[PDB]
Design a protein around this ligand. Structure first.
Ligand code: HEM
Ligand code: HEM
Ligand SMILES: CNCc1cc(OCc2ccc3ccc(N)nc3c2)ccc1Cl
Ligand SMILES: CNCc1cc(OCc2ccc3ccc(N)nc3c2)ccc1Cl
Ligand SMILES: CNCc1cc(OCc2ccc3ccc(N)nc3c2)ccc1Cl
Ligand SMILES: C[C@H](O)[C@H](O)[C@H]1CNc2nc(N)[nH]c(=O)c2N1
Ligand SMILES: C[C@H](O)[C@H](O)[C@H]1CNc2nc(N)[nH]c(=O)c2N1
Ligand SMILES: [Zn+2]
Lengths: 413, 408
């Protein structure tokens, strides 16, 4: 690996120099002969595996607080070592936990929202023992993060993995999502993405309202036990009815969405420690709802209905009727959130902020790992500045990682 | 190993074995992906490259290991020994040119790969000869609007001091002019090339869409200027099917996209002048050419005529204007019966092409970053298609601009 790797912006001619890649920890999946940049996804640490992972993290932490090589640094190293030696694991200090969580976000190459990384409220839920306790922590998280529409980024962190048979897990993929129901005739009601999870909830005892926008219950697993169902207090779930500034008929589509995007199925890795339940939330970029949630064929798939209402010629693709409807839908989403004073960011503002963030990171940190395939928005790509920005992708730790869905691995008791 | 790629929308999974054949580098390493970086002989080097290519040729016509196959290898070997290079057969030239297109990871139009008219120009010696070959190419490929894919191949590189080069980046392009007030008239992408033409004696009309002259270099000599006969240059006035004011913008574009600055590599041989052409995907013009900030940059003017609220970004005024411009481009070419493909139709065809290639070839190298259209990405099927990118030869490669190398 070369000491200096350069990236260029082809629109501004700005050249940046990356050295941070030398701190790359894990493999990307690519090789000299193949690139897997468009691949979506390309038993515990032993004592001997855990020692150097912990030291690497503690070193990084003490370097960050300008106490590298200090007596406190060396004493922390020794304490962590003795703890691994005598218990096969260790506990993070609160300061370290907070630092680790912020940096997993700072390191998330797929996240366009990272200019905000240092403003993250960290809830330490490592004292939690039961699903009811998990429910309590999650409600408080939702309430704090929602903040009556003035959304605040936050993460709640449950106890780390021990032997792998006592995992805490949130079975939901996000804390707030809508049910999907497969009909006998093959049609789907609600969100098709969530059919499998919905079916699991029903089997566990959930009585479904069988509507188009039914907020799913929480399915929560503590200490490796069977998961338990809970209903999120509806007053904690902020939603926005979707309407359009010009088209009065748009509201008649009956669309709405929830305000808080809160991903709950990822694993947080800090210093070799694994936090299998670490739900975190920010605020939406409009295209996540307007393009993906609403217009993906495998989701709500509303393009045709909207186009019809718009009286477009839908006979030839070259009329660009889909593209035309897509913009109006995204206009409606942004307008509806802003009107209800619920935090949201459009794709232009978000990508422009990210470019500034990336340049700042290159200058203060020596780089900023970024996944172009994910950073570039799903509409109007080249009229956003990120399209023209060369990026380097690599994996730094602390990190957020994918993990298998818990129903595929759980040992039912 | 066998690698799998999945389409997350259709759930179709394909298995790639073809990547096992690649020997050129991608630019990535195990620790760093460079997927979004734009640009990441001797007798001893030459023969194994030649052999590799002759082998796949003879395999392709199902005569691998035949007497003819063996004879060709010996013929090539002797030829490299006695001349330090070799010459391809016409059949090989055609096979190699089609496969370079077939292997072009970044090209969404590859479903057409085997329909390519190959013009052998290896007997060319002067810039006048190059001009002639290029006029014939343009006339054939244009075909009164019924565009036909073609490539014209000029003599291969020898010592590197006698390169044939087309200095233009495309055969047909519009000039760009720096203005006293610091602004730019015409295409800003071509300001530097335009200046060179002017210095070499071209008399500029100084308009917004002046077709550039050809600047052609033969056998390493200084390049010479030629004017493409205007009757050979097919153009399309851009209008909109609903907005009658759109024509008043005075926009036009040329029908024939003919990239002339790449290098074609076949069997270790290097063809530094190999202009090739197909037909346009609408977004190439309507999104990139017209709406890139560093290009014609017309979003603002259009959004004005649409009387959009351009005060906040979240009104999506840029996105709205962008769609209308691309509607206009497609409508204009179609009305004038000039071949063009929209990004929906094109990406659909590419998905079908991929299926074909996995079935008959064991894979298809594809660069998602380039294949996904610059607008409406996720409502096209390629956005949801996992791709594997790897480099196969014969190939088209980038090369430096000749004005950064040429001694006059
Ligand atoms: C504050 C406002 C934020 C915005 C606007 C934002 C924006 C985004 C967007 C648009 C994506 C792509 C989503 C998709 O297509 O599925 C994404 C991905 C991601 N975000 Fe952020 N985000 C924000 C906050 C956060 C926070 C607080 C965290 C963690 C503490 C985070 C971590 C991640 C990670 C790990 C991914 C990649 C997930 C994956 O690979 O599936 N983001 N972000
Ligand atoms: C026949 C209709 C064709 C269509 C619709 C088409 C479409 C496209 C498009 C839209 C691009 C992206 C260009 C950009 O964004 O700058 C591209 C790239 C490319 N095409 Fe095709 N193409 C066609 C024919 C051809 C032919 C005939 C060749 C060569 C014989 C070819 C070779 C390439 C190569 C090498 C690239 C990548 C250029 C680079 O890496 O900079 N294409 N194609
Ligand atoms: C379901 N699509 C894949 C996937 C995406 C995931 O995250 C998307 C994601 C993650 C964090 C976000 C934070 C803020 C925001 N506005 N969107 C965000 C979107 C997480 C797990 C999986 Cl498996
Ligand atoms: C420049 N030629 C010298 C040279 C010849 C080489 O092989 C020549 C040659 C000739 C005939 C062949 C027939 C079949 C075969 N498999 N290899 C064959 C190889 C290999 C390397 C070099 Cl460097
Ligand atoms: C200028 N953008 C990068 C670049 C693109 C190039 O070619 C784009 C290209 C190549 C072949 C094409 C064939 C058909 C078509 N419609 N577009 C096509 C577009 C060549 C050199 C460079 Cl440096
Ligand atoms: C930085 C990035 O690689 C660069 O802007 C690429 C992105 N994708 C592209 N895709 C196509 N088809 N053409 C391009 O010129 C580019 N530019
Ligand atoms: C196949 C491809 O990797 C997949 O569709 C990716 C493309 N880019 C994406 N980008 C974002 N932000 N989110 C996504 O889900 C995807 N999906
Ligand atoms: Zn890669």
């Amino acid at each position: 690996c070369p000491r200096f790797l350069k990236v260029k912006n082809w629109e501004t001619e700005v050249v940046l120099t990356d050295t941070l890649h030398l701190k790359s920890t894990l493999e990307t999946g690519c090789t000299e002969y193949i690139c897997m940049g468009s691949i979506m996804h390309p038993d515990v640490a032993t004592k001997d595996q855990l020692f150097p992972l912990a030291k690497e993290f503690i070193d990084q932490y003490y370097s960050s607080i300008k106490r590298f090589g200090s007596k406190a640094h060396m004493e922390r190293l020794e304490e962590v070592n003795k703890e691994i030696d005598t218990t096969s694991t260790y506990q993070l200090k609160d300061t370290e936990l907070i630092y680790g969580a912020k940096h997993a976000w700072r390191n998330a190459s797929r996240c366009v929202g990272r200019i905000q990384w240092s403003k993250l409220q960290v809830f330490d839920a490592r004292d939690c023992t039961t699903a009811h306790g998990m429910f309590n922590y999650i409600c408080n998280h939702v309430k704090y993060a929602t903040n009556k529409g003035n959304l605040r980024s936050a993460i709640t962190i449950f106890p780390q993995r021990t032997d792998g048979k006592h995992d805490f897990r949130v079975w939901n993929s996000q804390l707030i999502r809508y049910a999907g129901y497969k009909q006998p005739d093959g049609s789907t009601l609600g969100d098709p993405a969530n059919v499998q999870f919905t079916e699991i909830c029903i089997q566990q005892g959930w009585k479904p309202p069988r509507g188009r926008f039914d907020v799913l219950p929480l399915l929560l697993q503590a200490n490796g036990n069977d998961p338990e169902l809970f209903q999120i207090p509806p007053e904690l779930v902020l939603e926005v009815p979707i309407r359009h500034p010009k088209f009065e008929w748009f509201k008649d589509l009956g669309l709405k969405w929830y305000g808080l995007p809160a991903v709950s199925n990822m694993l947080l890795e800090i210093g070799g420690l694994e936090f299998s339940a670490c739900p975190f939330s920010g605020w939406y970029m409009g295209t996540e709802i307007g393009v993906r949630d609403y217009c993906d064929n495998s989701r709500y798939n509303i393009l045709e209905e909207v186009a019809k209402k718009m009286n477009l010629d839908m006979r030839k693709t070259s009329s660009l009727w889909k593209d035309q409807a897509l913009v109006e839908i995204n206009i409606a989403v942004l307008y509806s959130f802003q009107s209800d004073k619920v935090t949201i960011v459009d794709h232009h503002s978000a990508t422009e902020s990210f470019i500034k963030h990336m340049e700042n990171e290159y200058r203060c940190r020596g780089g900023c790992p970024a996944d172009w395939v994910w950073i570039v928005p799903p509409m109007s790509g080249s009229i956003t500045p990120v399209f023209h920005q060369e990026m380097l992708n690599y994996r730094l730790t602390p990190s957020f990682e994918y993990q298998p869905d818990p129903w595929n691995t759980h040992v039912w008791k």
